[PDB]
Amino acid sequence: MVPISPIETVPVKLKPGMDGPKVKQWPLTEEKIKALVEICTEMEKEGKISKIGPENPYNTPVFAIKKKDSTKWRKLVDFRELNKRTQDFWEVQLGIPHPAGLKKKKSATVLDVGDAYFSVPLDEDFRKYTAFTIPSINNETPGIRYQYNVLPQGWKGSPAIFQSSMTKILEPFAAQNPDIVIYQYMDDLYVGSDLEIGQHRTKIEELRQHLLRWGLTTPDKKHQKEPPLLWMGYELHPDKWTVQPIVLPEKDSWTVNDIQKLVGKLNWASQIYPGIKVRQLSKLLRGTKALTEVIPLTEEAELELAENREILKEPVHGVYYDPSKDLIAEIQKQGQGQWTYQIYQEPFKNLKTGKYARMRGAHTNDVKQLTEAVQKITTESIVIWGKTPKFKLPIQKETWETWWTEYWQATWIPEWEFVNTPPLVKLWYQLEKEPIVGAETFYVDGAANRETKLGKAGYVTNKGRQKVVPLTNTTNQKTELQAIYLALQDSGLEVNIVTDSQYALGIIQAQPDKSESELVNQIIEQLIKKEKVYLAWVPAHKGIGGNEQVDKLVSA
Amino acid sequence: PIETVPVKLKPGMDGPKVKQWPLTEEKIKALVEICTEMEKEGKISKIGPENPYNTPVFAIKKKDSTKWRKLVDFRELNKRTQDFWEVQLGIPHPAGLKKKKSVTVLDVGDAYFSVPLDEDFRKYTAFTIPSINNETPGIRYQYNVLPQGWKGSPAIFQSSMTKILEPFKKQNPDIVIYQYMDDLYVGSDLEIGQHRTKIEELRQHLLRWGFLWMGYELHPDKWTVQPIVLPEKDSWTVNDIQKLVGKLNWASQIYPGIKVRQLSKLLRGTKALTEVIPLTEEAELELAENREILKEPVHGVYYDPSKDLIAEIQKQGQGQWTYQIYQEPFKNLKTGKYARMRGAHTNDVKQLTEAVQKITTESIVIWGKTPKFKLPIQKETWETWWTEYWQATWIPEWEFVNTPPLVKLWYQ
Ligand SMILES: Cc1cc(/C=C/C#N)cc(C)c1Oc1nc(NC2CCN(Cc3ccc(S(N)(=O)=O)cc3)CC2)nc2ccsc12
Ligand SMILES: [Mg+2]
């Protein structure tokens, strides 16, 4: 017999104030009882479980299940109640590596570490809470009562404790074979290396010879997989990766559940298939919950879907990461708040692709959205590769410099270069910093009645030009914008505008280039046609002329 | 020091469960090396999966030093750690620190690692060095000693610090020493000549008690509410007068007795913005009376220690930033302006981060606490970049301004 090291037990407690589970065992058929007795006798011989006396007051129900061709039963212990009562753990498995962040390895193998799982002992003081009862035949004797000595399948703490235990066992092996990489998830263990295959299979042998010091049996994974390896939705070839094939169904009747799983496929595909778009197909789900409702796909949703089918026409592939090369991210504007991007090291060999969609807002502009896309890609790149990429952006350097030097917020984007691929992001208007000599001055005002919603909007100018239009179904805020719009419509290419509307100044000083308000949009289109606009603000109701005269004109 | 001080969270709240944000590879590597040495020195230990807590960590470089330093973001733990009446029921913030000619900031965070942390509280100091690309589980640690940046550390160390310093204080009754978090602030009315010496005099005095070569020198002789200033002009356009009436109307919410009637009357009719309007005598007098009102201090401002301090910042362009500190709107307790942010002439965010640190420092000197910032920046831009330029071992709270304030005009 060879001494094996004990695996260090993790201390576990129940949530404060909570006791263990006390759930009654369901009655079972005579055949299920017989099958459960057979199974638990075997588990008991392997040290997994142990018989307890009647002193333990906790209980978790146990069931017997089957399958189609599997002519025998398996044991299911239902730990739902215990899991609700068990303390929270550090669960350290929630993300997986992105293939584009991986480095190519000459050799890679998968190990099955399923057996090692139940050689992880369970904290002694916690076992009592795992008790379960095999009901007796005809209920004429006491039930056979057992508790777990190892992490039970289904118990809340078993994934984190098993993973944490393996990590600690593996740490010496990894740290002292720096030419190896080891990755663990579920009961699978992945080893990769750049060793010729002779010495790789021996490092594998050394690894089970390391695992055996804790008495952990690890054979080669039964029925091995060969290139590509299929893993977490990907295909990993030795020198390239891609996603598992994406198939979009044809349907003449789409439901909201059909659609939201079309977006999921498209979202999945968008990490390597450049230019995927999902806004129009996401638009058909803004607000609904009974998810077999049919939706007419708009012809805008159909063109988007048909555009997606064309990009999906082919397989595409990404390459693995080379740390000795630069990391580059290029972004293109797609329209309607949509952006796409490719991350690469050599031209035409993408590491991965992606997309970004405009946040929900009343008004917005292209430069702000490009900035957000940059920040999203920055953070993703830090996750994946541990560094910020150099950016190639469809915005002229002078456009950016004008934007950030004049914009009222602080803003910044990291090292980047202009790439001349239309449509380019541009500033569509810029207001004057000073009043314009020789340009006509328009004093604008609007006003509406709360009850009737009847309003007026208009202007008076230093040349005696004047206009007031009566309006229905309006509000003060709309009349204030409508007045600015009238002044832009009726003036020459250079114009000074004086308003008392803090609301309208707040919108325009935000520099939107597109809006949810058709009226704001009309103002933007006018601004674009102008050569110079100066917008001045004055307080209302304070006797300042022009503003005084137009105020009386529009206030009934 | 063998005997730990018992510490608890506030009643009915668990420890922090804050997500670690992603880190670049060079910061991860720096943190691995620092923590390996800390773990060898007993200051931190590896923890197991039964600890579900987490506090974020990153790595910085203190102002113009080239060695990485670990910074733990204890904001959540500090909010959840019991209020501290440690050996006192309150340590008077020295109201005379803000008046001293020169104040030097000394990092003494290293002294905290001499004191064990309560064994029952250690699990709440959990933090994670993240992996790149989820390629390994993060490295999980908890503190065994008082950590830098935690609210309880100056509180629990206060008994030792006052005794370490008392021989120096006995010799120097002129010198104010104030502790906030990891830093000592040392003020004197004498010139930098003998100030540096006394600073190193104090510094080597810490060496004989079981230290850091760095400092930072402030002059709180400046710190006021800046006056509202009106233009002095020989010819006024319509536009100039409109801007003046707008500024005065804004100031009438702060100051009583501001009048714009006689100035507004100059704007009779519908005139071109660039047309020159002579000032009458009545408008001239009104302007003069307004000028007279604005040189006196604002009526009814003082600091309520029960209330948050709020700090607002405006980007003014060309490297200039204005700010105001207040508790109630229009009752500014301090206003200020910065320019030429060092090594940042093309990076707005770096400039903003330095201004935030500069304002927080003034706030600690004046009141002994940090303000809640209203930052003129979109959240995703700030959240992506601020840690890149942060150099302080404390971190204030902040919120984001998405609508441009008209008041920027009035502070420019
Ligand atoms: C994350 C990960 C996944 C797998 C999946 C297996 C399956 N199902 C395997 C390993 C080692 C993983 O973990 C890491 N993988 C890498 N690189 C990879 C290694 C594998 N190649 C693909 C490949 C190479 C050679 C052959 S071959 N010639 O033997 O048939 C077949 C396939 C892609 C890059 N780097 C790291 C760094 C830290 S962990 C880790
Ligand atoms: Mg009006």
Author numbering:
A (entry chain A): -1 to 554
B (entry chain B): 4 to 213, 227 to 428
Sentences from the paper on this structure:
HIV-1 reverse transcriptase (RT) (hereinafter referred to as RT) plays an essential role in the viral life cycle by reverse transcribing the single-stranded RNA genome to a double-stranded DNA copy. There are two main types of RT inhibitors: nucleoside RT inhibitors (NRTIs), which act as chain terminators and compete with incoming nucleotides in the polymerase active site, and non-nucleoside RT inhibitors (NNRTIs), which inhibit the activity of RT noncompetitively. NNRTIs are a group of structurally diverse compounds that bind to the non-nucleoside inhibitor-binding pocket (NNIBP) located ~10 Å from the polymerase active site. NNIBP is a hydrophobic pocket that emerges only when NNRTIs bind and induce conformational rearrangements of the residues defining the pocket.
To further evaluate the resistance profile of 25a, we compared the RT inhibitory activities of 25a and RPV against two additional clinically relevant RT mutants, Y188L RT and V106A/F227L RT. While 25a and RPV exhibit similar inhibitory potency against WT RT, 25a is more resilient to Y188L and V106A/F227L mutations (0.70- and 1.7-fold change, respectively) than RPV (2.2- and 4.0-fold change, respectively). In the V106A/F227L RT/25a complex structure, the much smaller side chain of Ala106 buries significantly less surface area with the inhibitor. Furthermore, the double-mutation causes more dramatic changes in the conformations of the NNIBP and the bound 25a. In particular, the cyanovinyl group of 25a is flipped so that it can maintain similar extent of interactions with the mutated Leu227. This torsional change, however, diverts the inhibitor away from the tunnel lined by Tyr181, Tyr183 and Tyr188 and diminishes the contact areas between 25a and all three tyrosine residues. To compensate for the loss, the right wing of 25a shifts closer to Lys101. Such movement shortens the distance between the linker amine group of 25a and the carboxyl oxygen of Lys101 from 3.05 to 2.76 Å and strengthens the hydrogen bond between them.
